[PDB]
Amino acid sequence: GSHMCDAFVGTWKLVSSENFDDYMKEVGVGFATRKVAGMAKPNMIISVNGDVITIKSESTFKNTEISFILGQEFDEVTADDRKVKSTITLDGGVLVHVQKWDGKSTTIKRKREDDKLVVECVMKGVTSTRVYERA
Numbered sequence: 753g754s755h756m757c758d759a760f761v762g763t764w765k766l767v768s769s770e771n772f773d774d775y776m777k778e779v780g781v782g783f784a785t786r787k788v789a790g791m792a793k794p795n796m797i798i799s800v801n802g803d804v805i806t807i808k809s810e811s812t813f814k815n816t817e818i819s820f821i822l823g824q825e826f827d828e829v830t831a832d833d834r835k836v837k838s839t840i841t842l843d844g845g846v847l848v849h850v851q852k853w854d855g856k857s858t859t860i861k862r863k864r865e866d867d868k869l870v871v872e873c874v875m876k877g878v879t880s881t882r883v884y885e886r887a
């Protein structure tokens with residue numbers, strides 16, 4: 753086993769969101785995509801197989817899937833169709849995901865807190881908090 757497996761692996765459902773529209777504005781997402789994406793209630797499926805972590809997000813808006821090794825950069829196409837270079841590390845028990853594109857950067861942190869998986873998305877001064885619980 754591993755810390756990663758015990759903390760994050762499973763199937764999670766979105767239960768609350770704060771400031772996600774404002775986060776998406778700051779990222780540069782256009783009006784129509786913000787409206788449809790902001791309505792979504794994704795499930796987050798996290799798995800581990802050896803060194804490879806997979807995070808899948810399934811919703812009525814888009815389905816995404818990333819697979820990666822901690823510390824090792826990869827190319828990602830986000831739900832809003834940005835082509836980013838991503839690096840994900842596990843720092844003090846928090847998954848830290850940095851996306852770089854067009855000279856810009858956003859950081860997504862995933863944390864266990866009580867029975868929740870808390871996602872914090874930061875773009876310059878703007879944070880969105882999205883709370884997931886086990887399905």
Ligand SMILES: O=C(O)[C@@H]1CCCC[C@@H]1COc1ccc(Cl)c(Cl)c1
Pocket residue numbers: 766776779781785789794809830831832860871873882
């Ligand atoms: O949907 C979620 O809770 C997940 C949470 C984890 C980070 C990824 C995503 C949030 O990030 C998004 C999702 C959709 C769009 Cl359109 C943009 Cl700009 C970002």
